Every structure is written in structure tokens, then in C-alpha cells.
DNA sequence: TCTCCAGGCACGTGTCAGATATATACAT
DNA sequence: ATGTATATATCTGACACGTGCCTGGAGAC
């Protein structure tokens, strides 16, 4: 059959390791599919427009890093650039 | 191949006479081998391959199945358990529309269990059956029960009932089976109940069941005794009597 | 081996990489920018599974129903911003009732 | 012909479906273990001592 | 851009939650 | 006269795990 492209079983596991006895209908998991990339095209335009605006030719971590401080209204954002500096440090350390 | 076709026979002189019968004997002497020989007896007699349907307890329905299969192989045996795939699968099976009788068909031994009746009062309540055997019928010794309401909403006016005793409430289930089989004449249970007791008793039954006793064969079964074995309590199980008695 | 355990995160590297190459963004892309945007979609994911968790035992029920992040979405002003101005399938109404519109 | 070999494999599962829904010792010894154990062997007209 | 292998997708089987039923003594 | 209480007994019904496979993400230049 087609080989269908979909974060549901992420989502679902990420599900099963915060929340280790709770379920889920498959409905809910084409709705936070519709959500990953709608956020996922609206954060991917945003900083090419941008990096397009600085003219620079390529996506770096400070584009997409300036693009998530400015894009969201808060909170989520104020975690997210640590979270994000911290998992690219984890990366250049391996 | 024995006075069970003489009976069957008695069973096709009432059928020819339009009454529904009880069948009160108790099982042993292959009640399901004489019910598939009425069966083929009534094929050979006017016909018919068509609608036969077999309402059968879950454990005795592969029972059924081998039995017939071993038996009388000459017709097609369909089962009716399994998830809703196979319900779907088999409802496209049985689509027919095409009433009276039919030869090349494939519904002509079918086979069901009381809850998957029950579980499909929208979807049995069309097609319309030609003949009901309902075995074991100690199930519907109530009249509130909802099997018995699905089983009372057929239009098929053929009630022939398989069971061991029907004796198990002699109140409401006598007047439950006798309306069961001509639901015209009784619908009301206060005229059977005002209309010694145990004289009167028997003559109201008495042209309807059949009177067959176990022992009238060669008693090779194994003559079972009952042998009853008393005791005494433990001391763990003595003070747990009190303790159950202590809080009330 | 994989990319995504070098990185230390869950949600997968090579596929949003793989999704950035032929998703006509940039002709050039950097090696940690599908990392980071793996960790803000994390985070965005954990914040609102989160959220329809507390939901959900706040209805006392095993599976998230839609309802639920419904009112998991609109309890907070942060993603009333984000997701104020989307249309949401089969999501209700909030309980909000004016008290002049009550009676006395 | 399509059609009369969709219908062809539709009658045939149909016919295994309805066939599956209608008709479908000893026990063994401990594990003997021995590494690094000397052995000493007793038969009828030899005996072994296997050591270390 | 060459290579290559296992990660995730697809398709089966068991295993705890609802539904009817018995049932008989006690309390209202 | 009737609800009921609390355990049955069947008995389905929706849900999570154990095998194939293939192809694209990772190592190297």
C-alpha cells in the first residue's frame, strides 16, 4: 500500500511517557497532526521570509531562533529557545 | 430406528392438524437426530430446502453443526458466531429475496445462539422464517425477558420447542409456552389462572406432550445411584459462622 | 546511531530535515536548525499534552476527547493568541454567560 | 473478466471464511549443568576421574 | 553521491470493560 | 406486592502486542 507520512506514533509515545496511564481516539491524533504542521509550514515560512529579508541564503539556528522569540506570544517561547539551545548542545557534544 | 420415528410420525399428524407441539421428554435419547429426521421427512414430503432455522445454545451449537454434518451431509450447514466482519460476511450470505422454497440455496441449516438473537432485534426482524426449533428452552421459562420479546415479535407462526423439562415453574411459564404456541388463544394470564388442583391439572396438558419415561430400554446406561455424602465442619470453617452473624 | 538519540530528543531529526530539503525553504539548511525546530514542536507538543492531561482528569475520562483541548486551549490567554483567529472542528462553546443576561 | 474473477475471489474467501468459522506428552527433564566440576564416572568395568 | 541496514508502517491475535440473567430472602 | 442487593453465568466488544519489509536516514568521500 501508499507509505503515508505521519507523527502520530511520536506523539503517541511522548503521550505514553508523560502520562503513562492515559489513552487516546484516532481522531485526536489527525487533529495534532493537522496541528505539528500547521506550525510546522507557519514556522518554516516565517524564518525563510525572514532569512530572505536579512538576504542571507540558507537556515542556521539564528533564523529559525529569532523566528520562534518573535512568532509566538509568549511563555512557550521563553522555554522553547532554552529547551532548543540545550538540545543542539547535546547534539554538538555527541 | 426406533418408536422416535413413530413419534415423529405423531409429530407430522399434528403438524398436518396445524397445531404447534411441546416436546417435555428429557435428553438422551437424541432429541437433534429425530428433529433433523422431521427435517428430512418434510423434505421429502412437500419439498422444501429453504428456511430452517436452528435456535441452539453456544456450547451445544458445533454440537449441532457435527452432528448434522455427520448425520444428514445432504444440505448446507451455516453457522452464525463470530465478530462483525463475519456478521456482514454472512448477512451478504443469506441475502436471498426470494420467499417459499428454494433449491440451490445456501441457508438451508442455519444455526444461532439466544444473545446474537437478541443482539440483532433490527436486523431479524426481516426475513421472515418457514420453521423455528429452539433447543434448550430453559431460558425462557419468563415472559419479561427481552430474548422472549424478540422471539415473540417473528412472523413465522411455526413454534416447535426442544427442551429437558419444562417444569420448572409451574405458574407462568405453562401459560408462557402455551402462548408461545397459539398466540391467538391465550394473551391473558388472570383466565388462565382462575381457570381438586391436582386432579384438573393434568387433563389440560393432556393432548399436547408426549408421555416417554427413561426407563423403557435396555438399561445399559449405567442405572446411576445417588449416593449422598455428609460432614462436619472444620474449626476454620466453624467461627467464620459466627463472625458473618457477628455484625448484623 | 540514529540522529535524533545523537541529539538527545524524541521527535524525529532526519524527518523534519528530510521535510525541509524538498519543502522550498532555503536552498542551503543549516545542521542544527531541524534540531531546533524538533525541540520547539516537543515543546509545543508537551505544553499541550499537558494541558489535555489536566483536561482530562479534570473530566475524570481515560481518553482525550477534542473537547478537551478545546478547553485545554482556552484556558490560557498565551494560546487563545496563538490559536484565537483558527477554526476548530466539532469543539463547542466554553461555559461563558453574561451576569447581566442572567435573570436577577 | 474483472468482475467475474473479483466475484471468483470474493465466493472463495467467502467459502475459507465460512469453512474457518465453522470447522476451525512427556515432559522434560531438569537442565543438568556442570562447567569447571571435576567428574568421576563409575561403569561396569571401568571407572574415570576427570580432573583439573 | 555510493552503500546498507534497521525504524517505522502494516497486518494478525489475546485481554479487561459493558449487557442480560438467575434468584431468593429481606424490607418497605 | 414489589424493589433490591449482591454475587453469579454467559458473552460480546473495543483495545494493545508479536511478525514481515522496504526504503530512506546514516556512514563515508
Redesign the interface.
Known amino acids: 500500500k501508499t507509505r503515508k507520512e505521519s507523527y502520530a506514533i511520536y506523539v503517541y509515545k511522548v503521550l505514553k511517557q508523560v502520562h503513562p496511564d492515559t489513552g487516546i481516539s484516532s481522531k485526536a491524533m489527525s487533529i495534532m497532526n493537522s496541528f505539528v504542521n500547521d506550525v510546522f509550514e507557519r514556522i518554516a515560512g516565517e524564518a525563510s521570509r525572514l532569512a530572505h529579508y536579512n538576504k542571507r541564503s540558507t537556515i542556521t539556528s539564528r533564523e529559525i531562533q529569532t523566528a520562534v522569540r518573535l512568532l509566538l506570544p509568549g511563555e512557550l517561547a521563553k522555554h522553547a529557545v532554552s529547551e532548543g539551545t540545550k538540545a543542539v548542545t547535546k547534539y554538538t557534544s555527541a | 430406528k426406533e418408536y422416535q420415528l413413530k413419534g415423529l410420525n405423531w409429530l407430522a399428524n399434528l403438524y398436518d392438524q396445524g397445531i404447534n407441539g411441546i416436546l417435555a421428554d428429557e435428553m438422551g435419547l437424541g432429541k437433534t437426530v429425530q428433529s433433523i429426521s422431521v427435517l428430512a421427512h418434510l423434505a421429502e414430503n412437500h419439498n422444501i430446502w429453504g428456511p430452517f432455522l436452528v435456535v441452539t445454545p453456544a456450547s451445544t451449537l458445533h454440537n449441532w ?1 457435527n452432528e448434522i454434518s455427520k448425520f444428514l451431509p445432504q444440505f448446507k ?3 452464525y ?2 465478530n462483525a466482519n ?1 456478521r456482514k ?2 448477512r ?2 443469506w441475502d436471498r429475496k426470494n420467499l417459499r422454497y428454494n433449491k440451490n440455496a445456501p441457508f438451508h441449516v442455519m444455526v444461532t445462539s439466544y444473545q446474537m438473537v437478541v443482539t440483532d432485534a433490527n436486523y431479524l426482524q426481516k426475513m421472515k422464517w418457514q420453521y423455528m426449533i429452539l433447543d434448550e428452552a430453559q431460558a425462557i421459562k419468563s415472559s419479561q425477558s427481552s430474548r422472549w420479546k424478540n422471539l415473540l415479535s417473528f412472523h413465522c407462526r411455526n413454534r416447535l420447542l426442544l427442551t429437558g423439562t419444562p417444569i420448572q415453574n409451574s405458574m407462568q411459564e405453562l401459560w408462557a409456552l402455551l402462548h408461545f404456541i397459539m398466540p391467538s388463544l391465550f394473551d391473558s394470564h388472570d383466565e388462565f389462572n382462575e381457570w381438586q388442583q391436582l386432579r384438573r391439572l393434568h387433563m389440560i396438558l393432556k393432548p399436547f406432550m408426549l408421555r416417554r419415561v427413561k426407563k423403557n430400554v435396555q438399561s445399559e446406561l449405567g442405572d446411576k445411584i445417588e449416593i449422598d455424602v455428609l460432614c462436619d465442619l472444620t474449626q476454620r470453617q466453624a467461627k467464620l459462622y459466627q463472625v458473618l452473624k457477628s455484625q448484623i | 546511531k540514529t540522529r535524533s538519540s545523537r541529539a538527545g530528543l524524541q521527535f524525529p531529526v532526519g524527518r523534519v530535515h528530510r521535510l525541509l530539503r524538498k519543502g522550498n525553504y532555503a536552498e542551503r539548511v543549516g545542521a542544527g536548525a531541524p534540531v531546533y525546530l524538533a525541540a520547539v514542536l516537543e515543546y509545543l507538543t508537551a505544553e499541550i499534552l499537558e494541558l489535555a492531561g489536566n483536561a482530562a482528569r479534570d473530566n475524570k475520562k481515560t481518553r482525550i476527547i477534542p473537547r478537551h483541548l478545546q478547553l485545554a486551549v482556552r484556558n490560557d490567554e498565551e494560546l487563545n493568541k496563538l490559536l484565537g483567529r483558527v477554526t476548530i472542528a466539532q469543539g463547542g462553546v466554553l461555559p461563558n454567560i453574561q451576569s447581566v443576561l442572567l435573570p436577577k | 473478466e474483472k468482475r467475474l474473477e473479483e466475484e471468483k475471489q470474493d465466493t472463495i474467501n ?1 467459502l475459507l ?2 469453512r474457518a ?2 470447522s476451525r506428552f512427556v515432559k522434560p527433564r531438569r537442565p543438568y549443568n556442570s562447567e569447571g566440576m571435576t567428574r568421576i564416572l563409575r561403569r561396569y568395568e571401568e571407572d574415570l576421574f576427570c580432573t583439573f
Open positions: 453443526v450447514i451455516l453457522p458466531w463470530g463475519d460476511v454472512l451478504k450470505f | 467467502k471464511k465460512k468459522g465453522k
